[PDB]
């Protein structure tokens, strides 16, 4: 009845940068920060107007390379100066076939893009 707000809403894989308060004023704002390796999409800052919050942001997942899936598809991580066992969203992972195997002639390039936890793995088949 005076423009005040409850706590800001929680988000997966991120938190607010400030001390959590029971109550915020009209025109208050809080900024959010994504956990290390997550990528913030949307408005870093939300504001308390007319007793409700502007829409929070989203923390976009990195892709964690799966030994299980690579095994099933006869591939491995390509050896590059930089490629670790994860990728940030938007970063491209390069794969190579197992010794003995060549790219499946229905398959995705060996280079493929991390997108919010999701990675299309290529397939190789025996020569």
């Amino acid at each position: 009845s005076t423009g005040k707000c409850g706590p800001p809403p929680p988000i997966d894989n991120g938190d607010i940068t400030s001390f959590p308060l029971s109550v915020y004023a009209p025109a208050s704002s809080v900024e959010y920060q994504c956990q290390n390796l997550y990528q913030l999409e949307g408005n870093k800052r939300i504001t308390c107007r007319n007793g409700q919050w502007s829409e929070p942001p989203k923390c976009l997942h990195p892709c964690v390379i799966s030994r299980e899936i690579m095994e099933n598809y006869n591939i491995a991580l390509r050896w590059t100066a930089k490629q670790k066992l994860y990728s940030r969203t938007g970063e491209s992972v390069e794969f190579v076939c197992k010794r003995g195997y060549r790219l499946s002639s229905r398959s995705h390039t060996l280079r493929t893009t991390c997108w919010d936890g999701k990675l299309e793995y290529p397939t190789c088949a025996k020569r």
Partner: nanobody, 132 residues
Framework: VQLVESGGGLVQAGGSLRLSCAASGLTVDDYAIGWFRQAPGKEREGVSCISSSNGSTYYADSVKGRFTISSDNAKNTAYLQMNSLKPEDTAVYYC??????????????????????????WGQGTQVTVSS
């Protein structure tokens, strides 16, 4: 790109053997050449590595001191000199190359996470047998 192993075979324990790897078809002159080995039923083991650019090398703890790696770039070849051979060195030995720039020997398929990494190209493999 093609990789031919040679120089394997049978030897007596405490014997020596010089594996040779002949790389034809390479485009790049910044690359890494590796030797891996595998005995039937065990996981592949990265044995040694040499970068043509930064001269970094690597040896698995199981072969440090005993094995020495070199490349004669004129004949486009790498050598693994294997001394003081033991029965546990018995395995198929694969030559392999990786063509991404600035590779640091001991990373990737030579590190603790080797299971996660592969190589750009592979030899057919050559059998090495050390009798007791």
């Amino acid at each position: 790109v093609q990789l031919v192993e040679s120089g394997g075979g049978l030897v007596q324990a405490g014997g020596s053997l010089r594996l040779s790897c002949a790389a034809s078809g390479l485009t790049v002159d910044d690359y890494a050449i590796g030797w891996f080995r595998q005995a039937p039923g065990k996981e592949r083991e990265g044995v040694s590595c040499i970068s043509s650019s930064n001269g970094s090398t690597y040896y698995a703890d199981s072969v440090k001191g005993r094995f020495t790696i070199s490349s004669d770039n004129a004949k486009n070849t790498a050598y693994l000199q294997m001394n003081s051979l033991k029965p546990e060195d018995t395995a198929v030995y694969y030559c392999a190359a990786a063509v991404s720039p600035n590779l640091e020997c001991g990373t990737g398929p030579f590190g603790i996470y080797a299971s996660y990494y592969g190589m750009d190209y592979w030899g057919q493999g050559t059998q090495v047998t050390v009798s007791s």
